Amino acid sequence: SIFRALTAETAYWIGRAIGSESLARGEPCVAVGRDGRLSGPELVKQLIQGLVDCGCQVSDVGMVPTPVLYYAANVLEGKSGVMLTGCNGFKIVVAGETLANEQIQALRERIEKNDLASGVGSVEQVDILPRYFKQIRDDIAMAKPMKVVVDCGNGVAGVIAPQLIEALGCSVIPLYCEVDGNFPNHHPDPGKPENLKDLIAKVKAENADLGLAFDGDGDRVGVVTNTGTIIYPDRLLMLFAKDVVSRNPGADIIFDVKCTRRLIALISGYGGRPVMWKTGHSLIKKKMKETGALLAGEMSGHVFFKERWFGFDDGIYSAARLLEILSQDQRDSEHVFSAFPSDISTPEINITVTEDSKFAIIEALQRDAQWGEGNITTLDGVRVDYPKGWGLVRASNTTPVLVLRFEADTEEELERIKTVFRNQLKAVDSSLPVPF
Numbered sequence: 001s002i003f004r005a006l007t008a009e010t011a012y013w014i015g016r017a018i019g020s021e022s023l024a025r026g027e028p029c030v031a032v033g034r035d036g037r038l039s040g041p042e043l044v045k046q047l048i049q050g051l052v053d054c055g056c057q058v059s060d061v062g063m064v065p066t067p068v069l070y071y072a073a074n075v076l077e078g079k080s081g082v083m084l085t086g087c088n089g090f091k092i093v094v095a096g097e098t099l100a101n102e103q104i105q106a107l108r109e110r111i112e113k114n115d116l117a118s119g120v121g122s123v124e125q126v127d128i129l130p131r132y133f134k135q136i137r138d139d140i141a142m143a144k145p146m147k148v149v150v151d152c153g154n155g156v157a158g159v160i161a162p163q164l165i166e167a168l169g170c171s172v173i174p175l176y177c178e179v180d181g182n183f184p185n186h187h188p189d190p191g192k193p194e195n196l197k198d199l200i201a202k203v204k205a206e207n208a209d210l211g212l213a214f215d216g217d218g219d220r221v222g223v224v225t226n227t228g229t230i231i232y233p234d235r236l237l238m239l240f241a242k243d244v245v246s247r248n249p250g251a252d253i254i255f256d257v258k259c260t261r262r263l264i265a266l267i268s269g270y271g272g273r274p275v276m277w278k279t280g281h282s283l284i285k286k287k288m289k290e291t292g293a294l295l296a297g298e299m300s301g302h303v304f305f306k307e308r309w310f311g312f313d314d315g316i317y318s319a320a321r322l323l324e325i326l327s328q329d330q331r332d333s334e335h336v337f338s339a340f341p342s343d344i345s346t347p348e349i350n351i352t353v354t355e356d357s358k359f360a361i362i363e364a365l366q367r368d369a370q371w372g373e374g375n376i377t378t379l380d381g382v383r384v385d386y387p388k389g390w391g392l393v394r395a396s397n398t399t400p401v402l403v404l405r406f407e408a409d410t411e412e413e414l415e416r417i418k419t420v421f422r423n424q425l426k427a428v429d430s431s432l433p434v435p436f
């Protein structure tokens, strides 16, 4: 069985465990959304039935982007919500908390151990999209008009993104904005440059001001400039953190261990409190609540606005917030972003190891490695920060792979940092293949 940190029968008892855990937290009201996945329409029935056979009062918001289901769970009567999505699958909020780790296992263990509530629940249809759409239109303040290419990769974002962007005061060139679970074009994953090539060509050919790309369910956004430069989430956060801290002195801003060190200095320089944390949407949201942070972001493309918003990751709202800021600058999006400091960085580096060894390699490094003049963070793998650059090694959670990133202000410092990591991996196992 798959229960991280799948057919009809699986769906029913997942809905059953969720309902039970929601009720145990004193929350009978649960919202339920699905993405564009082909199995969706049918499979949410089983999820809803699981919930109803608990006594839950379900708000069925139909086919929505993931952050619209999060919105529902913030705005409707109940603080519980379930999103059917395969990035179907499940993103779960119970009594305000986005579940993770030993919480999803606490659900599965209800399945096996038969620890489940029983009752006669309720289903209610709710049309949340117009309220979500209006909520954003009312708060966003666009100045100049902008031409934007929008790539939805045939995911569920095309139900609201091109429309909302047009409504914000934009001319939209849609790309693959028809909801199609078959994903007949590139799969909707703006993290991979390959998935951005159609968008880059389209931005250039149509002389647009910006290109935007959404993932399948809309909780991630990718950004390209009017000249086709891909703007990574860490550089995007630089722009957002500047704006957010400008109205909120001392505000905490969270980012993950893969983000450029430049973001630490930048946030501090504007009077904010930078907070480096672990990877993963659940872990970020949790830290945001713990710290009262106004903004967070992750290298995978999840951006979390609490300021003027609700604090969940929302690719569509983040697009809006981006459009708001760029519309207030006379410069093209290319120059707004290029004005920020830049360093030499590598792409992510993968080393295929084995499932047996991956975590042990990292623990060996945490125990045995020597790092010279370096600040060590072991929040998530081993990250070492030097005055002139930094390096990261972590174990992939889903694949038997070590993941590395390096950044430095110079070509040489890059080498000098890369060299240290190579040596420290070799001290763990001299046979390990270090492809850098």
Ligand SMILES: [Zn+2]
Residues within 6 Å of the ligand: 066, 087, 215, 216, 217, 218, 219, 220
């Ligand atoms: Zn997603």
